[PDB]
């Protein structure tokens, strides 16, 4: 383990903690079809 190893790759400091982000107040679920909803509406 080294200080500079934390930087480079995808799981590195720059691409995982700075360019990306883990956030609160967010949800994920499988999507589904619903023909009674408008195009600008989400169930």
């Amino acid at each position: 383990p080294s200080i500079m190893r934390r930087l480079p790759r995808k799981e590195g400091r720059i691409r995982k903690s700075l360019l990306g982000s883990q956030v609160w107040s967010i949800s994920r679920s499988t999507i589904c079809g619903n023909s009674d909803l408008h195009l600008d509406e989400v169930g």
Binding site: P8, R15, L18
Partner: protein, 145 residues
């Protein structure tokens, strides 16, 4: 070299369509026009041929067009080559200008890789660190102040 020009291995005959203003000012499509589509690129080789119109040589090579015609013709070459890759279900034309105008703003055809970014934007270390290799960029930035 025997009976040919260097750089091209195959030379086919194709039918292509062009417009031309008639004597009555009418713009008509001419379908019975034959040309030569070659495999391999040599603008200067076909430049010297007396059977080929030197003014209307269309290469598919950005570097060869840049070498002999300039950066403005290389700008139009990048737009043409991306559009060919993009097919017909491709982006608007103004998105192809953004690639060519960025890649040709320094007078030379820069790339979309680490070497190209270092030429257009040498002093933007943080952007350069994020792209490819932060350790190499950070070390060079410190010594260069």
């Amino acid at each position: 070299t025997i009976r040919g020009i260097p750089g091209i291995k195959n030379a086919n005959v194709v039918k292509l369509m062009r417009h031309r203003v008639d004597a009555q000012g009418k713009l008509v499509r001419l379908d019975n026009i034959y040309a030569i589509k070659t495999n391999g690129t040599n603008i200067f080789g076909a430049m010297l041929d007396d059977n080929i119109d030197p003014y209307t040589i269309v290469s598919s090579s950005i570097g060869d067009t840049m070498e002999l015609y300039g950066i403005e013709a290389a700008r139009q070459k990048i737009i043409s080559e991306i559009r060919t890759v993009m097919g017909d279900k491709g982006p608007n034309h103004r998105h192809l200008l953004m690639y060519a105008d960025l890649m040709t703003r320094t007078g030379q055809v820069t790339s979309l890789e680490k070497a190209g970014l270092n030429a257009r934007e040498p002093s933007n270390v943080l952007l350069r660190m994020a792209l490819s290799s932060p350790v190499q960029v950070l070390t060079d930035a410190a010594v260069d102040s």
